[PDB]
From a paper:
Among these diverse flagellar proteins, flagellin is a major component of the flagellum that forms the flagellar filament. In the flagellin filament, the D0 and D1 domains mediate inter-molecular and inter-domain interactions and form the helical stem of the filament. In this study, Bacillus cereus flagellin (BcFlg) was identified as the smallest flagellin consisting only of the D0 and D1 domains that still activated innate immunity as a TLR5 agonist.
To provide a schematic plan for insertional fusion sites, the crystal structure of BcFlg protein was determined at 1.85 Å resolution. The structure contains BcFlg residues 54–229 corresponding to the D1 domain, which was shown to directly interact with TLR5 in a previously reported SdFlg-zfTLR5 structure. The BcFlg structure presents a topology of S1 (residues 54–56) - S2 (residues 59–61) - H1 (residues 63–98) - H2 (residues 104–127) - S3 (residues 147–150) - S4 (residues 158–161) - H3 (residues 166–169) - H3a (residues 171–173) - H4 (residues 180–216) - H5 (residues 221–226). BcFlg is structurally similar to its orthologs (PaFlg, SsFlg, SdFlg, and StFlg) in that it contains a three-helix bundle structure (H1, H2, and H4) appended to an S3-S4 β-hairpin. In contrast to the common fold, the BcFlg structure is distinguishable from other flagellin structures in forming unique conformations at the N-terminal and C-terminal regions. BcFlg residues 54–61 that correspond to the N-terminal region of the D1 domain fold into two β-strands, S1 and S2, and their connecting loop. In contrast, in the BcFlg structure, the C-terminal helix in the D1 domain is split into two α-helices, H4 and H5, which are distanced by 11.3 Å and angled by 72.9°. In the SdFlg-zfTLR5 complex structure, the C-terminal region of SdFlg D1 is also discontinued to two α-helices as for the BcFlg structure but with a different distance (16.9 Å) and angle (13.8°). These observations suggest that the C-terminal region of the D1 domain is a pliable helix that can bend and adopt diverse conformations. Because the residues 181–185 form an α helix, an insertional site was selected in BcFlg residues 178–180 (middle fusion, mF) so as not to interrupt the secondary structural fold.
Author numbering: 54 to 229
Write the structure that this text describes.
Amino acid sequence: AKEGGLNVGQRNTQDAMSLLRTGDAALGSISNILLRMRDLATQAANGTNNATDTDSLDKEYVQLKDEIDHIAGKTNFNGNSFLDTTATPPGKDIEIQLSDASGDTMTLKAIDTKSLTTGTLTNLKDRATAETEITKLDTAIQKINDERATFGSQLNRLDHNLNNVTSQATNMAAAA
């Protein structure tokens, strides 16, 4: 159901929780790919690879970059590609009205996953480039960890709202 355009009620909250689980799992896949990319970059920066091995590491690394972009574009809730605000059509925020909470609204914010990950990365075409990729990969791993933390926290918050669960944090926030 809606109330002045805004989405309300238990089933709507469940839908949003489903979007959050989808987003977290997709960002989890992206994080695991970034870890594999970090391993490849570390190997390639090492100094010790010939022409063929340099090429094979670079090929796999670039394939993994493309896989991140694929996941970023394909992930959706009901056709909304919320991990890619640069898509056509762009991912958009999802608004969720909380129940018995004085009209509080949660926004699942759509993000630019590519900008946080592949937009900052290049390739392993040479040893020197591979070395500088490592730092960039560590940065991207941390950014993705924050984005997943956001979705995880929002999921907990919706779970408490939908399931009428009160915790220490609820009791603390009651006065405000």
